[PDB]
Structures are given as structure tokens and as C-alpha cells.
């Protein structure tokens, strides 16, 4: 887990 990962919707299911 990275709180700074830039994907905004990609990682949401």
C-alpha cells in the first residue's frame, strides 16, 4: 500500500 500511488480510479473495483 502506498498512500501516494497516483492512480485515482484504476485500483478501485
Amino acid at each position: 500500500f502506498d498512500s501516494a500511488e497516483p492512480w485515482t480510479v484504476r485500483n478501485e473495483d
Partner: antibody, heavy 118, light 113 residues
């Protein structure tokens, strides 16, 4: 509907600077992360960076850190790539691309060509 | 970093025949959230790349069901059933699980006239 259009590409000398733009329409811009991906003259694809919807979180290639910066203007529906200290290895077609649920590069622009050469 | 090895480099197929393209990651590409962001792209002559397949086996909307993706571990495969002339171009695999994200070297699909 969804449209992405890059611009700013051109010939620059080694060590030079260039700013790329990417205009977006057809969606709520700030709801989506955007990426830069480049295609080399050898036709290889290379991810360069991804920036969050809000513009404050960025992943990028280590080899462009300290050279390239990435930012967006959400009030103007525009994504930017500020290049400096350009190298021959940077010569490529630069694409901007919008994410979607489940996928990294869902919509692509047409590209803008950057040539680094004396 | 994760190296993506794509084979074959080119693939001549008759119309109506099947094409199968392989992608091997140098290590595991399971994302921290448990998904595998393995994607396939097609670049037709003169055009930008376009998304075909995401999270290993999911077809992007508007993509014909002739295209399917499968795989696990470090081995992934794009299959085209009953190839059509519109399928011409270079296919690329891509992993978006571990930064820096990396593309396979591509496979050029050609028609055996």
C-alpha cells in the same frame, strides 16, 4: 466523446528544454489520473509518468527525475510535461493517456513528436 | 524492475485462423491490492495504441470477443480467434503492477495471404 490532444513537440538541441501539453475533453478531467507514455524510434513503448486526478501524487521513471516535471491544470482541462536537460534517449513520440477502473491506459491521444539532436 | 519478454516477434496467420501471443514477466506482478494489472494493447498501422484487455482477462468495452487474455504467475497469453484483416498491427503486453511500469517488446501480426 473522450478526446485527448497532445502538442508542443519539436526539434530541440541536447541539454535543451521543451514543454508538452495535452488537452482533454469529453469527461470530468480531475476525476482521472493521466499518464505520459513515449514511443521510441525503435517502436518500443516506455511509460514515463502517471499523475493523480488532483495533481499532487506522481510516479515517474527514475531516469527522468530531476529532468522532467509533470503537472496539470484542472481548471483548464490540460496536462503538462516540462522537459529540461534533454538527451538523445528522449527522442520519441509522446502520448498522453487517461486511466479508468481496472486499466492503466484506456484512452490515448494522437501523440506529439520530440526530436533531440544537434 | 520487471522485465516483460514477448514472443514471437512476429506472427503470420491466415485469415480465419488463430493467433496466440506470449508474454513472460521476470517476476511476480501481483499488485499490492491483490489484482494483476496485466494489459494488452494493439497499435494499428499509422495509429495510436489502443486498449484491448485489462487485469489479465477482461475485455475492454467495444473490443470483439475474438480477443481473449489469460494467464497467471509469470506467464500470460493473448489469443485472437479467427483473425480478420482489421487485426493487423503490433500487439504489446504491459504490466502496471510494480513501478516502473514496463511494456513487452511487441509482436507484429501479419496476414498469410
Amino acid at each position: 466523446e473522450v478526446k485527448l490532444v497532445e502538442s508542443g513537440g519539436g526539434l530541440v538541441k541536447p541539454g535543451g528544454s521543451l514543454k508538452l501539453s495535452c488537452a482533454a475533453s469529453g469527461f470530468i478531467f480531475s476525476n482521472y489520473a493521466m499518464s505520459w507514455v513515449r514511443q521510441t524510434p525503435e517502436k518500443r513503448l516506455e511509460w514515463v509518468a502517471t499523475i493523480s486526478g488532483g495533481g499532487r501524487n506522481i510516479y515517474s521513471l527514475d531516469s527522468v527525475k530531476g529532468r522532467f516535471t509533470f503537472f496539470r491544470d484542472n481548471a483548464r482541462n490540460t496536462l503538462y510535461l516540462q522537459m529540461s536537460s534533454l538527451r538523445s534517449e528522449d527522442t520519441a513520440m509522446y502520448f498522453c493517456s487517461r486511466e479508468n477502473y481496472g486499466s492503466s491506459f484506456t484512452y490515448w491521444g494522437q501523440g506529439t513528436l520530440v526530436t533531440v539532436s544537434s | 524492475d520487471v522485465l516483460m519478454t514477448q514472443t514471437p516477434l512476429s506472427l503470420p496467420v491466415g485469415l480465419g485462423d488463430q493467433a496466440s501471443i506470449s508474454c513472460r514477466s521476470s517476476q511476480s506482478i501481483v499488485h499490492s491490492n491483490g489484482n494483476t494489472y496485466l494489459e494488452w494493447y494493439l497499435q494499428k498501422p499509422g495509429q495510436s495504441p489502443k486498449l484491448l484487455i485489462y487485469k489479465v482477462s477482461n475485455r475492454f468495452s467495444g473490443v470483439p470477443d475474438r480477443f481473449s487474455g489469460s494467464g497467471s504467475g509469470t506467464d500470460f497469453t493473448l489469443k485472437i480467434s479467427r483473425v480478420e484483416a482489421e487485426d493487423l498491427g503490433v500487439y504489446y503486453c504491459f504490466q502496471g503492477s510494480h513501478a516502473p511500469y514496463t511494456f513487452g517488446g511487441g509482436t507484429k501480426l501479419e496476414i498469410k495471404r
